[PDB]
Write a protein that binds this ligand. Structure first.
Ligand code: CAC
Ligand code: CAC
Ligand code: CAC
Ligand code: CAC
Ligand code: CAC
Ligand code: CAC
Ligand code: CL
Ligand code: CL
Ligand code: CL
Ligand code: CL
Ligand code: CL
Ligand code: CL
Ligand code: CL
Ligand code: CL
Ligand code: CL
Ligand code: CL
Ligand code: CL
Ligand code: CL
Ligand code: CL
Ligand code: CL
Ligand code: NA
Ligand code: NA
Ligand code: NA
Ligand code: NA
Ligand code: NA
Ligand code: NA
Ligand code: ZN
Ligand code: ZN
Ligand code: ZN
Ligand code: ZN
Ligand code: ZN
Ligand code: ZN
Lengths: 312, 312, 312, 312, 306, 306
């Protein structure tokens, strides 16, 4: 019988998601990889237990995570029932619809049919009465935004999601989505964009829009899929040189490169949380350990920018 | 155990229903005839299986289809449970209320009482939690349109229908119905009118209204009840001459007359789908085969119009 | 096993309730008396069966009908389950809250607490998922009208009543109630006032207001509690003289006095239905027999008015 | 088997809560103390039975009452099932969320997550389908007021609370909360502030705001936690002198000091009810006995004010 | 959230109940007193948690335990749901019917109506699908033993009790009851008699009968209602016994519990407790369970007043 | 969506289990290894689908199979719901209790409490209303055999198991168990013993007893834990046996499975597998099941070291 570490809320920093009542853990765990039927459930279980023990209260899923599609939700559902049920109200659990889940015209994209039918499937797979956050997973250019937004509003009003969010929406469209949801009376809680030292698109307008609108943000691929780790220490030659120079700065800060890379995403206090992936419990411990040194000075930021813009 | 043809989504074209997230199959199957207790369930089952195998994802019912009334919904309900349940989220299932279903003042027309009580009966007969589209089946001149429209809005808000539509509404009234639904916040998805080479009323204003308003359309009786088929090849004498001349043009196009007649309804890309009836699986294969030649040139359209306006 | 008379919809006239989709039987049956534990269920059963056999599709209850309070709903609930369940969708069943039902501050009047808790009790006693019409039974001068009206709106939105109405509301207050309900989006279907040859208050403004607003009406005590019957043939002396003179006019019309008295309430086509009480099946047959002569000429109306204004 | 005293509605005065349909007992019983696992259930049961027998129809709980947290709701739940279920519709039961209930970021404060998850827990512990009043227990300065207010509106619309209220809100913020709720369409029923002879903050603006807005009020700690009782008769020396002088005035009125202190809170007819705590049935009898002399003259009010402002 | 001590099975002794598959802890906890609505649930909860943490896997209830009647079952039911549900299959939970529970002729004694209706009420109060052991709580001298025994047989066959027992049955009647249940196909698992240094009647035939028949035994009031403790003519015996306990390095209560289990003749002792320390004291008896012939002779001498 | 091979019943042999109505596939699949949380569900799913596609209709589980204990039942439960539910009435699913499953005196061995509580847990993990066969997994030398057998009888009468069996029971004890179950009215369907070319103890009396009593048999570890495969003094025997298999046109594993079923004396062989090819190899043994007296004499010679 699993018993959550009694010190878990001392080990983690919780950050308010935009202008809302929700505080997310600075580090959240994504189930994008390592929770399907091609990996071992013993390991999946160990990752979730380690995460909650360290104070990670947010687990992010999607209908099609696995492989195969739906298996991450099923495995999470089993582990939730077996180990976490007494603490479900201490967790923020998300899922999504918007990429390809099942074959045919109703198993992908942004229709009301797909969003409603898919959340019903997700709730069944996970064994939940509701999710905390339901996302539209990517934009659908060919479906009216109001249909998709009204499906999100309907799912909140009917108690299948407490809050809703959007993912992979460029700034212009995000603005439209946010304003529609506000008008419907179910405000967008959060935006999930890709953001790391190596992918800074959100700094071109998205982050400022979200701050304007009171919407939170949770960065995915914050380690640039593993590039911002020890992987290439012990990609292009220019990339490798950048990774070595960033790693030296991380060492100077008493951090692994991955730790500095996670800390850096929260450096301006305009991103709420970082969503990590993990295949082994030590990667979760390392991520949470980033909190020992979150601060970046102006000098450190300039040093990093010069490394990133460096050609030699 | 029925297993849907793995190539089904390669065999069919899916068309967006107005401005919405719903794509209907170019060919939909109606259960108006051949699904009641006066025909054989073995045949009914074969028709539904053949249809889905060819990519037809939309099955259109109504409360009073049979005979007797309600039997098409019951037979569909049984076949759905036995053969299609794992694929229910790949299907668009519709039903309707508005013609005579049961005796007395609450079993016909457009009252809130009849629409709500009838959809509850339909959901029970079909064994469904909700239908994808619920229609008001014909106008009710003596009930305020707002009562009927609010009943549709209520059924969507309370999760018994994902979308709503109207059938047999002339253009002026359709405009009023659409605008009311828009104001209530549950937009009309679709209009179901009668339309074929021999019944072109919708070209007098309805089709343009629906395009203006972003509402889709699904044509019923597209073969003019069997007249636009091989039936009279191997009605009036003038009709017969038209059928022979249209059949010659269809042969020139590598098509049966029925195939050309279905293709013709979608020729201007201002109708979403054609709703066919069938008594045998070969009629479903023939209908889907129309997709091999959907295109009509200006010259072909003029040739057809001249045949239709011909007196000798 | 009871089987409803196959000719029932030939025997009755159905009248549209204001501007709505609901047609009520010209004669409705009230369960105000003869359905409690102080009378015999065999008789109660016979009355309901006779009524439906003659085409009476509307049965009107209230929480406190009996005696004791709640017993009419229980007896109706049993008879409905035993005899009428297959035909529930052919019936309009109403109940009400607003007079004294249980002791204490929450068992009377017009609070949201009382209306919601009382309809839940009524639905349990009757064994129903919803009533067709739920009424506020009388005004509550000390509770804000908007609280009571919002409770009615909430019960419709949440599917416990298909429609709502008000009873015993004077015209000024009825106007306020109607306008509030319209603004909330759940329009008042019907008003239930006392109206007979001997109680004509509604002709002082109420009937014109209801016609203005598209609201129907159902008259209770249309026989002035039994005075407009054979009771005093085979009260004051002036009353008795009026009853004899009205009875002579009824005989001239081929009617019993009670038949003419019911017909008279519908004479101007500004009242929807008359709500009768009955202790024996013959009184229901007599009431429905009034339909053989509903018409009143200007001359007959003047003759009646002169009798009513007569002092000698 | 407990049977409620047949004279209970003769023994108590019921007072309208602001402009609403709800009349609260002049004396309500709070379960803040003496209903957890550190006291005896026999005593808890005796207190609730005595209270209802005397006409106290309102029992006020909160998620974290005990100790331990949740135990008062559980003990109340058991006693309700065992003894009070036939009379649940004669009771007003409240609960709250807003102080610390469970560990972590979702178990305290004012988020939609916490309010919804906590009311679901409360309904389970108490064995109820809904509470009569659900409160936000204290302000949350860091969560947008609209999120918290919309959670209250959502819980009413979805039938988990009949009415909502706020507690411990200063006047400025109370005004904002009230106006938001009005705009959402679920008006604030009641405000629960601390108020007694020794804590008169509400007279600085709150009571006038509530009267302006039609919102009721229920005073907690009306005996200043036991100071306004016999406790110090048979704190500071200045306090003690005040208690002796107030006690002499109470004796002159034929009252215990606690009785006068409760009566005084309702003296201006601008507070709805007083919420008492009790550890033994005699304290409930004493409280209800205050009703024998509720009236205060201008002279008595000046005498009390002079005692309160007295330094010697 | 309570978590059972991981070492709970490392020290406690488990003893097979007659010839059966059931091993009871040498010390079992009874809920006869201190589990009703007149004592604080915080304490009741602490007693159950301390007991299971020390390896006590058997909790003994009855319909009328409280006070008021039924409250011990309700309080236990709540604590079970809240704290113990994941470990229910590690517990042996008993209840009983046979004393006064409700008013009137069907709420006491030995009829099939009372036993069946009572176990249904107990299962509801405790929130259980079945009890591990259901007992007839005392003999009824006027209802045929076959009716009562058939009610026990019916309850096991219908899955409301895994096993049945009898309590307070004198030896001759116990023999009859045991033989009837064996014939019906639901053998008697266990007998619950009063037994202690001061109440040795079971040594006059009951214990030998149970051995003969393969039926287990669980002694109630093993400390003679608290007389065999630090709490105090019998006072002279208590003093003398306490001096022998002292020489054995034990509390008198510890020696008194050890004495009941001196032979494999008794399966378990059912203690009462109002405080966790009393449970800790009882489990500590395990450290010195042996008695020499000299010690037994000395005990008898003290008991017979020599 | 998985669709069972339409030819699945065209090649597999089915063998009647003693004197009963049950015919087991000649090759059955056990879930002892490679179905827990330490191996990938994708592979487990592929093994079950390949097995049923080849006509293997019997899947054998136990409460503690995994690791961890219970996970094989959970994973099987999930795959059953997802892929096999329409064909559940074409499957024989077994489970067992009798080894260590949970901590404490009620989570192992032979008591009625453990067997009943354990089958309830297994039915929940697997999402089944009943198993086809429930086994006592090993003998318990201290719980009366009647108690254990009556728990089996009770579970069948109450519809949680269609049939019962015993596993790992030596012949003399199996005789007693079989006779007790016959008397109770729920006859023993099947015995599951270890048997292979290297473990022939069942030929010393067990097989004859089962024939006499009409009870079937399903051999476990038929490849002696993988020794009778391509994986390798016994190594000299493995080499010599493999040369005989080669002359027969078979893999050693194939000849080893065929040998266990050489006589109608054994109903089925329960194989383990980590890859689908191992299942395919086992089913291929059906192509050469016969042994001449010369071949048997040659095998014995090899076995006895001549
Ligand atoms: C991190 As993604 C590919 O699920 O938006
Ligand atoms: C095709 As029709 C008569 O159901 O509108
Ligand atoms: C006819 As009445 C007294 O129920 O309004
Ligand atoms: C009386 As309070 C501390 O629950 O607001
Ligand atoms: C210990 As007793 C009096 O309940 O048998
Ligand atoms: C194959 As076995 C050790 O589970 O009997
Ligand atoms: Cl909605
Ligand atoms: Cl990453
Ligand atoms: Cl609605
Ligand atoms: Cl057609
Ligand atoms: Cl509402
Ligand atoms: Cl009348
Ligand atoms: Cl809402
Ligand atoms: Cl106080
Ligand atoms: Cl029986
Ligand atoms: Cl004792
Ligand atoms: Cl005693
Ligand atoms: Cl049985
Ligand atoms: Cl093997
Ligand atoms: Cl082995
Ligand atoms: Na994403
Ligand atoms: Na139509
Ligand atoms: Na009325
Ligand atoms: Na408060
Ligand atoms: Na006893
Ligand atoms: Na085995
Ligand atoms: Zn909700
Ligand atoms: Zn919905
Ligand atoms: Zn509804
Ligand atoms: Zn409600
Ligand atoms: Zn059972
Ligand atoms: Zn059965």
């Amino acid at each position: 019988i699993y018993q959550p570490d009694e010190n878990r809320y001392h080990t983690m920093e919780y950050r308010r998601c935009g202008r809302s009542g929700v505080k997310l853990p600075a580090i959240s765990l994504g189930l994008w990889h390592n929770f399907g039927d091609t990996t071992r459930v013993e390991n999946s279980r160990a990752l979730l237990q380690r995460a909650f023990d360290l104070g990670i209260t947010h687990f992010d899923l999607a209908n099609n995570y696995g492989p195969p599609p739906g298996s991450a939700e099923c495995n999470f559902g089993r582990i939730l029932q077996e180990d976490f049920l007494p603490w479900r109200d201490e967790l923020i659990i998300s899922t999504k619809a918007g990429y390809t889940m099942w074959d045919g015209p109703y198993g992908d994209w942004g229709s009301r049919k797909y969003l409603i039918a898919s959340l019903d499937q997700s709730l069944k797979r996970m064994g939940l009465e509701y999710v905390d956050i339901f996302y539209h997973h990517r934009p659908d250019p060919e479906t009216p935004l109001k249909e998709t937004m009204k499906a999100l509003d309907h799912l909140v009003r009917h108690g299948k999601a407490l809050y809703v969010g959007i993912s992979n929406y460029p700034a212009d469209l995000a603005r439209q989505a946010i304003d529609i949801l506000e008008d419907l009376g179910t405000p967008c809680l959060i935006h999930q964009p890709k953001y790391s030292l190596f992918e800074r698109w959100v700094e071109d307008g998205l982050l400022a829009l979200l701050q304007e609108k009171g919407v939170g943000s949770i960065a995915f691929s914050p380690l640039a899929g593993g590039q911002l780790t020890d992987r290439y220490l012990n990609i292009t030659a220019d990339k490798l040189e950048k990774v070595r120079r960033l790693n030296e700065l991380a060492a100077r800060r008493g951090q692994k490169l991955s730790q500095m890379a996670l800390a850096w995403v929260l450096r301006n206090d305009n991103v709420t949380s970082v969503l990590i992936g993990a295949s082994k419990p030590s990667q979760i411990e390392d991520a949470v350990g980033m909190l020992a040194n979150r601060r970046f000075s102006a000098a450190e930021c300039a040093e990093i920018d010069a490394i990133l813009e460096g050609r030699f």
